[PDB]
Amino acid sequence: NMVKIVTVKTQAYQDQKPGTSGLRKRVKVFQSSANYAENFIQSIISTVEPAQRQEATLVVGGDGRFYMKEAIQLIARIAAANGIGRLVIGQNGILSTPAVSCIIRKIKAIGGIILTASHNPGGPNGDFGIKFNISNGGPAPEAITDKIFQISKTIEEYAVCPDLKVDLGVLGKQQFDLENKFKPFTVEIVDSVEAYATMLRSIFDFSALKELLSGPNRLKIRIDAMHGVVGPYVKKILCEELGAPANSAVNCVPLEDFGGHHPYPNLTYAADLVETMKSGEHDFGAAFDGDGDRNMILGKHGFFVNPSDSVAVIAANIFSIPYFQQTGVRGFARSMPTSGALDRVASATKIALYETPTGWKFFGNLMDASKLSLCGEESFGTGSDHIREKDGLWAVLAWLSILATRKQSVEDILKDHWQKYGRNFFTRYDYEEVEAEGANKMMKDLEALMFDRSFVGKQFSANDKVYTVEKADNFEYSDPVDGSISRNQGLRLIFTDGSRIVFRLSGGATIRLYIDSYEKDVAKINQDPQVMLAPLISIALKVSQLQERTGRTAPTVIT
């Protein structure tokens, strides 16, 4: 642990873009491309001014996928050589994305490097990702990721301590003396769960939750971490501390290949959990994605809570949670394609509702302005301003808190909610890997059609019901915090009855078609969703001429 600093000549790569969720490549790319990881790590660290490196701490950890520990060792060797004073690293390299955000904010780190590719498959033939978060605990913004990219493109050398090796498996402080450097390099290995659990212990009423989850008359739960990073969090918090029986923790051992499956929480990737819930034995089920910031919520018999409804239900019962009883509710937000269910709650309770373009930064900005308490995305995303990433296990404890106060089943809570606010039937059609020319033509033609002065007021017949266009545009957002203007964020068809159709191209092309059908009638709100959605789906396909432009007669995926 007495080690030399050396300078390594390297050759730059041209494709190392950090994106909004990190640099992601196949594992084999990282393995076969000389200094691929080294170059990128150096580029991140070179964004930190030399004068500020010794007093800086970086938080480092990841989702447990293959190659993670090797990448972490590399980050330590390079951080040390570059004069970064300290790393804080989760035991075994493990930290969920929400735990990283938690720890950065708690210890006032300059940021963190997260070894995750989120839900993407891992293993020797899978994907790997390197994500950079800054001092507010959230994703590095474009100005920073721009700078990292620029540096990586022309880098000709990096600094490294080749003989430095960190023991990731044992808790505590390891110090490294660097040759011809006065100050030591320090690594603190922390328990992967402790800080995050201590945070949750202050947010939620663990006494109430222990009462709910323990004993003969307990709420019966099945919580599926999909062999990813949230596993130990489930075991240590829900089972060990809150007393849920050990069987409650499903697929809660992190695996380097996530068990050979894709850790994304939806009805088909988490098919095993759904089949478990179908037996009527359990009251509540949930699944998480690989790095822990997405969640799916299930009730008895595998009743599916739509993510757009989940955030609305949490909003409508938000003072069941001690944190909000103390902060108050500062605002609500959803991404524009997410259903308008949250809006109904916000309008009725007179709380601001922010409708943002797709992406974290819009939520993070509003939170940093003390204007946003609770946010949701239709893509299984739920969060609050307790940190600056979405948080799947948090959403689960929010649901458990509501179940404890309401003393009703998941399905009955939703039925009561629909009765009170009306129901926003919702689905998302994905058309994957469509020919770009056809997708682009479809969008440009539709947008032109929508811009015509006569389009507003146009009527579309169902069947029975007539839909009337209230507004039609290509969504634009002026950020109230950083002043940026986001344009071309999705074609919106907004109907006078509270329903909407939205088309986006994904950022082969992917078309995402979102259908939001609002119904107030008692005779309609408990019908089957794809049946109730069929009229607007028909209207959407006809006005867009999607089949004509793409050759597709059906979506690839329906959620």
Ligand SMILES: [Ca+2]
């Ligand atoms: Ca994720």
